[PDB]
Amino acid sequence: MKTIFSAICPTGVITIGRYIGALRQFVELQHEYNCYFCIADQSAITVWQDPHELRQNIRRLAALYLAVGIDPTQATLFIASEVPAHAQAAWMLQCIVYIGELERMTLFKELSAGKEAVSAGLLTHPPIYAAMILLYNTDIVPVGEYGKQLYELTRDLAERFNKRYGELFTIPEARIPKVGARIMSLVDPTKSMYQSDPNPKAYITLLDDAKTIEKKIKSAVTDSEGTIRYDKEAKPGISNLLNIYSTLSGQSIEELERQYEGKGYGVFKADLAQVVIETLRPIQERYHHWMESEELDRVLDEGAEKANRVASEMVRKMEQAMGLGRR
Amino acid sequence: MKTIFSAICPTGVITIGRYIGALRQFVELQHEYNCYFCIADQSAITVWQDPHELRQNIRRLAALYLAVGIDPTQATLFIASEVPAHAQAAWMLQCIVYIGELERMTLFKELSAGKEAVSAGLLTHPPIYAAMILLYNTDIVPVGEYGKQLYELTRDLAERFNKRYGELFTIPEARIPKVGARIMSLVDPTKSMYQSDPNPKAYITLLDDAKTIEKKIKSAVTDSEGTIRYDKEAKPGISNLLNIYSTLSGQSIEELERQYEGKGYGVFKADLAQVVIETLRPIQERYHHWMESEELDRVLDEGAEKANRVASEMVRKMEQAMGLGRR
Numbered sequence: 080m081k082t083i084f085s086a087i088c089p090t091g092v093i094t095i096g097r098y099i100g101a102l103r104q105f106v107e108l109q110h111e112y113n114c115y116f117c118i119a120d121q122s123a124i125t126v127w128q129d130p131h132e133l134r135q136n137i138r139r140l141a142a143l144y145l146a147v148g149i150d151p152t153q154a155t156l157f158i159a160s161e162v163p164a165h166a167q168a169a170w171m172l173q174c175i176v177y178i179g180e181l182e183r184m185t186l187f188k189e190l191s192a193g194k195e196a197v198s199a200g201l202l203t204h205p206p207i208y209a210a211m212i213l214l215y216n217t218d219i220v221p222v223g224e225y226g227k228q229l230y231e232l233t234r235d236l237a238e239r240f241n242k243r244y245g246e247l248f249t250i251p252e253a254r255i256p257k258v259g260a261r262i263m264s265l266v267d268p269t270k271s272m273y274q275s276d277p278n279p280k281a282y283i284t285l286l287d288d289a290k291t292i293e294k295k296i297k298s299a300v301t302d303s304e305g306t307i308r309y310d311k312e313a314k315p316g317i318s319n320l321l322n323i324y325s326t327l328s329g330q331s332i333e334e335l336e337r338q339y340e341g342k343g344y345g346v347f348k349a350d351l352a353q354v355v356i357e358t359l360r361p362i363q364e365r366y367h368h369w370m371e372s373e374e375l376d377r378v379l380d381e382g383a384e385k386a387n388r389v390a391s392e393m394v395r396k397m398e399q400a401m402g403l404g405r406r
Numbered sequence: 407m408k409t410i411f412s413a414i415c416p417t418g419v420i421t422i423g424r425y426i427g428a429l430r431q432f433v434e435l436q437h438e439y440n441c442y443f444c445i446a447d448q449s450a451i452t453v454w455q456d457p458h459e460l461r462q463n464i465r466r467l468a469a470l471y472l473a474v475g476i477d478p479t480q481a482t483l484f485i486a487s488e489v490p491a492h493a494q495a496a497w498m499l500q501c502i503v504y505i506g507e508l509e510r511m512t513l514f515k516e517l518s519a520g521k522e523a524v525s526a527g528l529l530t531h532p533p534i535y536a537a538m539i540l541l542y543n544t545d546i547v548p549v550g551e552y553g554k555q556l557y558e559l560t561r562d563l564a565e566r567f568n569k570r571y572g573e574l575f576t577i578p579e580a581r582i583p584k585v586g587a588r589i590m591s592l593v594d595p596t597k598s599m600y601q602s603d604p605n606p607k608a609y610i611t612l613l614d615d616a617k618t619i620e621k622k623i624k625s626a627v628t629d630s631e632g633t634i635r636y637d638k639e640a641k642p643g644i645s646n647l648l649n650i651y652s653t654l655s656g657q658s659i660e661e662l663e664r665q666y667e668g669k670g671y672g673v674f675k676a677d678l679a680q681v682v683i684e685t686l687r688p689i690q691e692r693y694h695h696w697m698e699s700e701e702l703d704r705v706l707d708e709g710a711e712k713a714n715r716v717a718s719e720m721v722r723k724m725e726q727a728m729g730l731g732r733r
Contacts (some may be wrong), residue, residue, distance in 0.1 A: 120731060133730070160730040178528075179522060379732070
């Protein structure tokens, strides 16, 4: 077996673009790998978070991950802050990393620069992230779009601590995003669907109701020609809709082109909306069921007991190697 | 009962200076305040530390503190790293502090700036310290020499936190050290006594044996004169050794002037070494007995439960205030 570790910030929403190019994969992957799904509450508070909202979100996300198909008998689903080890290890690691290394993190440079007062959270989060990964002997890590610098630093740190106090950390390898394209924005198919899009018309959320999925799907920017055929360059919006239909229906794009021969955007967009709805119907019913069950707390409890057991012993190894404590 | 909290960095030697002007008092204070003596191993590693050596000093400091008279029944002796709440809390405070505040730190601007290869624990250390202090609802903190900045920063963070999330923390008050001429150099009568002094004949490790106590005492700088009289300025060597005689042996300086009138720098450095060695003898006696006993471990355990029972409850009150985790 190999171990995959996935960190989810309990902030924001889940677009079908993240459900399709990332999250839904794991419903199978959990059966081929040792999978960790960790809710990074601790990474959330590096910027202001309304305590009541944050606590709510941590819980929603957990329900959604379960509704979507993550199996807590085969995977470990847990909240970071419930594993004290994560802060323990991030401090050791904070003592290994140089200031420069953090200071030239792009993401820090972005949301820091300009502003005059910034929390040391944004600057020192990486060790916290890298500690989440290395603590469990993580063979494989999801990287995707922005995460390149983070991955690379986690890999450097794991190396650097290994060349010093000895070899203890597995060097994680970045995971290969599957064959396929990004899911684009419904109001500008020249850009990827992001949840941080100003315009809520651009993305669809796993929690959206029938009416909204309709509006957002029907309002999706097409083209002047009138044929349902795939061509990213010439017909990006209509291509992107074929792409979504294809991944959620299980039919090929070539099957779809033929099925809608001499048909037009109207029925095609209405059909597409039923597909998206049919997909989110069971996910949402299950979602609500989880939010109404103590079985939810029960599952997160079991989650943490697993992680602690695994991560504490790794904290013990790190201490017994730098020379902290006793034993 | 007001609570004092003292963090001791497990790195090197306790000169008699720190004994006479700091540590000895606490043998008394422990009876009138609720005291915490925390061996700050977690803080040690902001710089390179040899594992074996580091892990020795931790053991040593704990012995030495017990040896000198620190009663584990009245106070609470403990190693930091053994209390996971210090790490947890330090991450939270890291998210609340300003890169501005950590970067203006004299201690920091001093022991870096050349080269451009500096740890990050070194810049993010204040929040770690703050967290030790605030975790225990500490009412008083020893400051003195170079802590005004670190003490001030703790106050700020404790108010900023209460301000944002509710009033949780006690705002630490600074205990100004007692009025008593600092212990000066044995080679440089006009300069104080720190363990940083290159000249190893300038200071006297609490753990020194008689043969070396002879050399350092009887080879201590004075003046070409020959009368036993106090004058920190003109007789800076004698006035030092004189001060040292007073506090240790018990008799005032003036009384020792009348007893050492008609005498010189031969008999006055004859008995001084006799008092130092006589005063250090039972210390090392009890010291070595701690070092060799399984009891030093049974105390540090008990110490840790004591500390972990208070510290982790606070962490829970924090997480509740910030939104983190559950329940």
